[PDB]
């Protein structure tokens, strides 16, 4: 790492840590603000390697989940709902963290379920249908329940009613955090020293 790169790395990792911490305490407002700082940082030299790439994939996934209830916003060049983008990012997380299909399958299922359900809650039935088709022999009962919910425009169904986006996003955070090193960032260590 060269001089500015070294600092930019410390900065990026400090805000990554703070972002995770914000998300963990359901401080999504703080999360979005920190997200925006990190987005601004991405144009600066970071000496990007695989561990920066990893951190950013995780941050990418959380950012899409945090915006997941907002179907008006988009993360891809053209058409994808935020949670659909989160699905895409999850595949990259699997690659860059070298995870087994077994380890990621249950979390991929949660995102897929959430992606369809959020569309249903917004009465975006066609979107829900497309996502259900595109992404969903184990989740038989659920995808059949969802297929019937969409077909019948049944917002009252227990599957829909009992869905908790807070529960979902916190489960996703726990999953993502479980593949990260929980080391304290240098700048925070330095701050505690100074104070």
């Amino acid at each position: 790492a060269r001089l500015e790169e070294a600092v930019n790395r410390w900065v990026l990792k400090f805000y990554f840590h703070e972002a995770l911490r914000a998300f963990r305490g359901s401080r999504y407002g703080d999360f979005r603000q920190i997200r925006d700082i990190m987005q601004a940082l991405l144009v600066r030299p970071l000496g990007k390697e695989h561990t920066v790439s990893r951190l950013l994939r995780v941050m990418q996934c959380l950012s899409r989940i945090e915006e997941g209830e907002n179907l008006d916003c988009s993360f891809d060049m053209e058409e994808l709902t935020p949670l659909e983008s989160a699905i895409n990012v999850l595949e990259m997380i699997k690659t860059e963290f070298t995870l087994t299909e077994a380890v990621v399958e249950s979390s991929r299922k949660l995102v897929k379920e959430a992606a369809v359900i959020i569309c249903i809650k917004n009465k975006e039935f066609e979107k829900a249908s497309k996502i259900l088709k595109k992404h969903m022999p184990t989740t038989q009962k659920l995808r059949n329940d969802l297929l019937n919910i969409i077909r019948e425009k049944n917002l009252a169904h227990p599957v829909i009613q009992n869905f908790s986006y807070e529960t979902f996003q916190q489960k996703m955070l726990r999953f993502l955090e479980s593949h990260l090193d929980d080391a304290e960032p240098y700048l925070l260590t330095m701050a505690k020293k100074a104070l």
Binding site: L42, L46, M59, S63, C73, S74, F75, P82
Partner: peptide, 13 residues
């Protein structure tokens, strides 16, 4: 090619 701010884009477009 587009850089990190695009390929590892964090904020929505």
């Amino acid at each position: 090619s587009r850089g990190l701010e695009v390929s590892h884009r964090l904020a929505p477009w």
